Ligand binder design. Structure first.
Ligand SMILES: [Mg+2]
Ligand SMILES: [Mg+2]
Ligand SMILES: [Mg+2]
Ligand SMILES: [Mg+2]
Ligand SMILES: [Mg+2]
Ligand SMILES: [Mg+2]
Ligand SMILES: [Mg+2]
Ligand SMILES: [Mg+2]
Ligand SMILES: [Mg+2]
Ligand SMILES: [Mg+2]
Ligand SMILES: [Mg+2]
Ligand SMILES: [Mg+2]
Lengths: 67, 104, 259, 88, 129, 70
RNA sequence: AAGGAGGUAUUCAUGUU
RNA sequence: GCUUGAGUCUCGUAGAGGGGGGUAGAAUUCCAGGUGUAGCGGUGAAAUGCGUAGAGAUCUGGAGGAAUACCGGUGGCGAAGGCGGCCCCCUGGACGAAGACUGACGCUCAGGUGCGAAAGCGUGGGGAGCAAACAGGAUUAGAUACCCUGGUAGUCCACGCCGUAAACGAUGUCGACUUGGAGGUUGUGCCCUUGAGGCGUGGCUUCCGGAGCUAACGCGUUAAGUCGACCGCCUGGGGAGUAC
């Protein structure tokens, strides 16, 4: 599966990059499991935080149906 | 002094106040011996979910080194200035001067 | 054998290999352990409704590329097309169907336009060059391989890329509007795209005007356009200014309310 | 906790060079500064039992250090508990 | 906390013999070296040495005769929680004399047999069989 | 799971896509889990039991390849 | 609901979709 | 005296550790409207119940309380009880690298002190959902139950009580020693990072397992092997964790 953050040296995932985060949410808008994406556990936690911060700022939708 | 990433989003129909608001907040921070490290007016962006039945709001981003007290006062200004729809202040361990992904 | 497949591609080999099939990604090849990519105009050499000879049946695997990381080859039936296309596309890059004032043989529907190959060249174009409605994929006028009509605009004949336009013929709606619709006439239009800074309402075929967020309500300056009118709603707006040069309509909703 | 600059000042005052951080006097002085600081926190936060457990460790450690110092050299001990303004 | 370094040394010998190790090592002290000498002269260990200037390390090379370890049992007798002293008449006989009782007399640490001949009592460190 | 009807796509084909989309979002499993309240102890017990048996079956399988049944 | 296949499961260009 | 146990300082790292304050979205309920009309709801099947004073359904707005899907993991943090949206403020511990410093300053601990799920108690709030008691409907030979429709205290907050649980690893704390394997998680060093590689070295953790221990089950370097320090407890079953 191979983590795409360990191989890029990324320190913090960043919630302002709405291209990487879109790859890590599903169509409904929920966060995809690390078991599927092959992300490491450390970057998974960072990634989940970034997605939640983006949702608050309405860069990402919470769900597919409130819009 | 701590570092802060401040993102506030303004009403789409108060778009012309954003320059003025930027200058006031920058002046407040800089007057308290602050250090504005980044300032990116992202502009009018399509909200992902309707807020107050308001699509397409005006995003502003600001990365700042400033005392906690001045930062608290700025957050209070947000709480009362009923043109800013949302704000978020985050504490960063170091200063970021690099251009954000939203700039280009 | 993958080494030898890459070496036979270095020879411009035209081998008899098992095509990988037909797909939205063009055409796949299969040369003895080399799954080949090729685009929609380079996935096979037969221009028919079922190209399984190129991809899906033992047929032409062409020398188009060798990619280790893609496990990939030039999976398209070469040794047939582009061969006489040399002289054909020479006459094409000399003529271009009257300098792109020509018909073309369509290929498929793309995410950015609509493409008609030429046989030595291949042009594209926009979807709103033969229509005016809010479009996302304009391919609903023909199937793959039909005969469309366009006028050439930007053609790079040193790379075999073309881009014709489909508005070199149709009477301009703007010119008739300029004589038909003087400023200050009220007409009804359908909101095609809505923004916070303005809502685009299509009043006529191929004419979209921008009604500013400041022109949505005179007495509540802080009202989102998305809350007052939905995309596709028919609203009456008064034509305030017509910019023919910029192809812009400034429409005023403020005249329906009171200042 | 205690800032970098505050620790540096205290080490200079109570240690016989800038590199003397392990002296009993310096350790008691650092513990005393942090203990005195936390009083305001626990005045506002009477229900912070977890942080208060950390504070009780500090108080307990200061007593052990002072006991050692009193048994090891009584004169330094009297001087220290006078400077630091500590009873017993 | 470590509060019986003699018992620790006996434990290392016992565990090393049970795990068929060639040699065992421990931090050194003069009491450990004295006990080690008695063991070596009674033939329970093959050799011992001390290496190190500031933090000496005592190394004992253990003995096996027919594949089996030579020391069949070794137990601390006097311990910090309960000290044992015996008068010259009351010295023990480990395994009816086939074992040694390391007894720390006033003339140094020796075996039960040596102390009984010298007419001394003292503290009983360990039993060795 | 918001499925838009595609062009020329028959109803059966579109319906299969929609059913699979819902099964991918796991809606029905979620609803069945929220029908009734279960104590946190019950939830933890069930989670731990599934892990134990899943691990045991993986280990049992990975040792079954070792030996021959005939 | 019933059966089959693959695994403890994915890398499997993106794009298209 | 000494530096190896125990501590201090220097730079980082991970974390549902704690306290306070804000905020976001989904959903449940209620309220007011629009469209609409004869059922809804519930069950093994029904009935109570709600509905022509227009329910249920659907759309719009509002109020309010409580909890944070996905991530999420025999994952992490905490002495234990326990801790799960996001942001800020105050604050505790753990670990790693290299180096400097103190120089046995240690371990255990009766009595004592503090923390300690849920239920409960006092005083005042708040109350959407759920729900002892209770009311009704069924089931049944009976049904003071299981099932259904409601429903109060309570669950939430603030401040005090209470001090208890299968408060469990049914395994007291500290230290040392003794063959291995596959993993997780968090640091760090090196080599060619040739491209998620290779090679080491720390902390915590899950599962197999050897010798040895285990009535046996098992346990096994995180022991329930081998040892030492100190404390807690046990002495047939019932009476009884009861009486005084
Ligand atoms: Mg400290
Ligand atoms: Mg006690
Ligand atoms: Mg309670
Ligand atoms: Mg109460
Ligand atoms: Mg009350
Ligand atoms: Mg009930
Ligand atoms: Mg008890
Ligand atoms: Mg418990
Ligand atoms: Mg348990
Ligand atoms: Mg017990
Ligand atoms: Mg085992
Ligand atoms: Mg009693």
């Amino acid at each position: 599966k191979f983590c795409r953050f360990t191989a890029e040296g990324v320190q913090e995932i960043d919630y302002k990059d709405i291209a990487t985060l879109k790859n890590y949410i599903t169509e409904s808008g929920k966060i995809v499991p690390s078991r599927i994406t092959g992300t490491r556990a450390k970057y998974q936690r960072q990634l989940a935080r970034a997605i939640k911060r983006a949702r608050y700022l309405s860069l990402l939708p919470y769900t597919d149906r409130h819009q | 002094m701590r570092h802060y990433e401040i993102v506030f989003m303004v009403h789409p129909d108060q778009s012309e106040q954003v320059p003025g608001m930027i200058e006031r907040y920058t002046a407040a921070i800089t007057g308290a011996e602050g250090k504005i490290h980044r300032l990116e007016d992202w502009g009018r962006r399509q909200l992902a979910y309707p807020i107050n039945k308001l699509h397409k709001a005006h995003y502003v981003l600001m990365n700042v080194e400033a005392p906690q007290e001045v930062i608290d006062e700025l957050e209070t200004t947000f709480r009362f200035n009923d043109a800013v729809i949302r704000s978020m202040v985050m504490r960063t361990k170091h200063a970021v001067t690099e251009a954000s992904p939203m700039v280009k | 054998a993958w080494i030898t497949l890459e070496k036979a591609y270095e020879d411009a080999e035209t081998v008899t290999g098992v095509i990988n099939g037909k797909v939205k990604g063009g055409f796949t090849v299969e040369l003895n352990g080399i799954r080949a990519f090729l685009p929609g105009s380079l996935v096979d050499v037969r221009p028919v409704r079922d190209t399984l000879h190129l991809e899906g049946k033992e047929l032409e695997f062409k020398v188009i590329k060798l990619d280790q990381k893609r496990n990939n080859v030039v999976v398209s039936r070469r040794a047939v097309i582009e061969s006489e296309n040399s002289a054909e596309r020479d006459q094409l890059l000399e003529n271009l169907q009257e300098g792109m004032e020509v018909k073309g043989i369509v290929k498929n529907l793309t995410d950015y336009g609509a493409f008609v190959d030429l046989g030595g060249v291949d042009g594209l174009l926009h979807i709103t060059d033969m229509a005016w409605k809010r479009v996302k994929h304009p391919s609903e006028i023909v199937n793959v391989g039909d005969e469309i009509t366009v006028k050439v605009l930007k053609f790079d004949r040193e790379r075999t890329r073309v881009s014709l336009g489909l508005k070199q013929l149709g009477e301009d709606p703007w010119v008739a509007i300029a004589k038909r619709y003087p400023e200050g006439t009220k007409l009804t239009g359908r909101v095609t795209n809505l923004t916070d800074y303005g809502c685009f309402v299509e009043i006529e075929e191929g004419v979209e005007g921008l009604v500013h967020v400041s022109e949505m309500d005179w007495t509540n300056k802080n009202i989102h356009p998305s809350k007052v009118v939905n995309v596709g709603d028919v609203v009456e707006v008064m034509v305030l200014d017509i910019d023919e040069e910029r192809r812009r309509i400034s429409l005023g909703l403020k005249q329906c309310k009171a200042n | 906790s205690l800032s970098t600059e505050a620790t540096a000042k205290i080490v200079s005052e109570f240690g016989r060079d800038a590199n003397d951080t392990g002296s009993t006097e310096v350790q008691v002085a650092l513990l005393t500064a942090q203990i005195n600081h936390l009083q305001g926190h626990f005045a506002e936060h009477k229900k912070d039992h977890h942080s208060r457990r950390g504070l009780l460790r500090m108080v307990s450690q200061r007593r052990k250090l002072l006991d050692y110092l009193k048994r090891k050299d009584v004169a330094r001990y009297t001087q220290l508990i006078e400077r630091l303004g500590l009873r017993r | 906390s470590m509060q019986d370094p003699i018992a620790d040394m006996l434990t290392r010998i016992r565990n090393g013999q049970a795990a068929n190790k060639a040699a065992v090592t421990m931090p050194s002290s003069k009491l450990k070296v004295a006990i080690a000498n008695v063991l070596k002269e009674e033939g329970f260990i093959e050799d011992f040495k001390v290496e190190g200037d500031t933090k000496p390390e005592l190394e004992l090379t253990l003995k096996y005769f027919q594949g089996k370890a030579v020391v069949e049992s070794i137990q601390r007798v006097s311990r910090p929680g309960l000290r044992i002293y015996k008068r010259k008449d009351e010295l023990p006989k480990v395994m009816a004399g086939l074992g040694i009782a390391v007894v720390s007399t006033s003339k140094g640490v020796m075996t039960d047999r040596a102390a009984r001949q010298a007419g001394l009592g003292g503290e009983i460190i360990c039993y060795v069989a | 799971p918001v499925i838009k009807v595609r062009e020329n796509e028959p109803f059966d084909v579109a319906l299969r896509r929609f059913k699979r989309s819902c099964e991918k979002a796991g809606v029905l499993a979620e609803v069945r889990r929220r029908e009734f309240y279960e104590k946190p102890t019950t939830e933890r017990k069930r989670a731990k039991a599934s892990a134990v048996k899943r691990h045991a079956k993986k280990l049992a399988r990975e040792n079954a390849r070792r030996t021959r049944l005939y």
